[PDB]
Amino acid sequence: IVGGYTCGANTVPYQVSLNSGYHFCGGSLINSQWVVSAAHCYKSGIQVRLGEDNINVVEGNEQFISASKSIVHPSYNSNTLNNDIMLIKLKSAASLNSRVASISLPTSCASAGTQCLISGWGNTKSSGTSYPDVLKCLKAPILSDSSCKSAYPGQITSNMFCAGYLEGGKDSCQGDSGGPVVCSGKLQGIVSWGSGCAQKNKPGVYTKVCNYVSWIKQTIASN
Numbered sequence: 615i616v617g618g619y620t621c622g623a624n625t626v627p628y629q630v631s632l633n634s635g636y637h638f639c640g641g642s643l644i645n646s647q648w649v650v651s652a653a654h655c656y657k658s659g660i661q662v663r664l665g666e667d668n669i670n671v672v673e674g675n676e677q678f679i680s681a682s683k684s685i686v687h688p689s690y691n692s693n694t695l696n697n698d699i700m701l702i703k704l705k706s707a708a709s710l711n712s713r714v715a716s717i718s719l720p721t722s723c724a725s726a727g728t729q730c731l732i733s734g735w736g737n738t739k740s741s742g743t744s745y746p747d748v749l750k751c752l753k754a755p756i757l758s759d760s761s762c763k764s765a766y767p768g769q770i771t772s773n774m775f776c777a778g779y780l781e782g783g784k785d786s787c788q789g790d791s792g793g794p795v796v797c798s799g800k801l802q803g804i805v806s807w808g809s810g811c812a813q814k815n816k817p818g819v820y821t822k823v824c825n826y827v828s829w830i831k832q833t834i835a836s837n
């Protein structure tokens with residue numbers, strides 16, 4: 615996250631970390647057993663870390679649970695990043711508390727102009743590399759499908775939306791992928807892609823979760 619702020623410890627209770635010996639992606643807890651992340655975050659033997667603030671220090675609110683299933687969208691395209699969504703089933707159910715909770719799925723697509731909260735342990739620098747210990751937070755509005763397509767001609771599918779600032783200065787970045795975009799109390803986005811971070815006319819591009827609600831519910835029911 616570039617141009618964000620320190621969330622505060624366990625102030626994003628749905629924010630998880632996907633660890634393969636190290637943090638490489640975010641994810642969103644949507645119920646006791648299931649996480650939504652980005653398809654491009656797929657890898658074998660994922661450990662899910664919940665109740666994290668400082669991802670490099672044990673603070674005592676963590677739950678560490680192995681992924682038993684990692685299910686990439688059937689039409690995920692690694693080149694276009696179309697359908698950049700994955701479901702992870704937890705080997706056991708997370709314990710509900712003030713610090714570890716699910717975020718609700720959308721019932722509708724949110725409107726351009728709606729404010730969203732974007733969170734993660736990704737790069738905080740648009741030039742060079744700095745990884746924060748503690749979770750960073752950004753407030754960023756959904757941008758018009760029109761200004762998104764203007765920024766990324768020939769690249770924005772109906773499964774993608776832009777959020778942020780056409781002037782740049784605030785964005786998601788490398789290591790935020792799979793993390794939540796939460797608008798009007800609902801999970802509307804997954805951190806997917808962008809050209810650089812926080813650059814002018816180059817806002818973050820997010821998986822449009824409202825298109826996947828029926829696939830998510832069917833996957834959960836079957837598995």
Ligand SMILES: CCOC(=O)[C@H](CCCNC(=N)N)NC(=O)c1ccccc1
Nearest residue numbers: 786787788789790791807808810811818
């Ligand atoms: C695991 C690393 O992936 C990520 O977190 C990022 C997220 C990008 C956010 N960028 C914004 N401008 N908001 N994804 C990639 O890397 C990417 C690749 C190639 C091209 C673009 C992104």
Ligand SMILES: N=C(N)NCCC[C@@H](NC(=O)c1ccccc1)C(=O)O
Nearest residue numbers: 645646707708709710711714715716
């Ligand atoms: N399908 C199940 N077997 N579930 C058991 C729930 C146990 C546990 N978890 C939550 O209720 C929870 C829900 C959302 C987010 C985090 C936890 C509890 O009893 O604490």
Ligand SMILES: NC(=[NH2+])NCCC[C@H](N)C(=O)O
Nearest residue numbers: 618619620621751752753754
């Ligand atoms: N527009 C915002 N995102 N405001 C929140 C920034 C952080 C908050 N003002 C604080 O003192 O910790």
Ligand SMILES: [Ca+2]
Nearest residue numbers: 668669671672
């Ligand atoms: Ca920790």
Ligand SMILES: [Cl-]
Nearest residue numbers: 721722723824
């Ligand atoms: Cl709708």
Ligand SMILES: [Cl-]
Nearest residue numbers: 726758759760
């Ligand atoms: Cl629009």
Ligand SMILES: [Cl-]
Nearest residue numbers: 763767768769
């Ligand atoms: Cl176009």
